[PDB]
Design a protein around this ligand. Structure first.
Ligand SMILES: [Cl-]
Ligand SMILES: [Cl-]
Length: 162
């Protein structure tokens, strides 16, 4: 298992514009297009992202290319963020994937906001961090995915994904 396989399980794959769990226009492997309510504003973002007139539909290669970009952006955002970088540096390989996952879903700013849990991760207080991560809107809104990520933090293995 690796980051790509982990995120592909969490986000799934869709080749037509769809709405995410929050109601936002998305496509591919969890590629957020816009928070705007307009499907047209969504098709404009999509065409711009792909570089062609898509009419709201893309191919598998195009989905995977957006995904590759997004994973890279998640990682680079972590390494550039003063609050996240130190946590990342501190973790083992498996747990690093879990933080990338949270960032991919919620954005760097959002994760950076989990101040207390970040401190517990850095201190390697696994059980405590897991409990603290669960007291969140994130956990309450997407509980099965949050549990999977939390378990990865708690154990440092890919069991939740196997
Ligand atoms: Cl893009
Ligand atoms: Cl879920």
């Amino acid at each position: 298992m690796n980051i790509f396989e982990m995120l592909r399980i969490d986000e799934g794959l869709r080749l037509k514009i769809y709405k995410d769990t929050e109601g936002y226009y998305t496509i591919g492997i969890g590629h957020l297009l816009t928070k705007s309510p307009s499907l047209n504003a969504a098709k404009v973002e999509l065409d711009k992202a792909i570089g062609r007139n898509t009419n709201g539909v893309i191919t598998k290669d195009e989905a995977e290319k957006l995904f590759n970009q997004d994973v890279d952006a998640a990682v680079r955002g972590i390494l550039r963020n003063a609050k996240l970088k130190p946590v990342y540096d501190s973790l083992d390989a498996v747990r690093r994937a879990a933080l990338i996952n949270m960032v991919f879903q919620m954005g760097e700013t959002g994760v950076a906001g989990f101040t207390n849990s970040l401190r517990m991760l850095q201190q390697k207080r696994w059980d405590e961090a897991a409990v603290n991560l669960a007291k969140s809107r994130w956990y309450n809104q997407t509980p099965n995915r949050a549990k999977r990520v939390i378990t990865t933090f708690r154990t440092g293995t890919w069991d939740a994904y196997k």
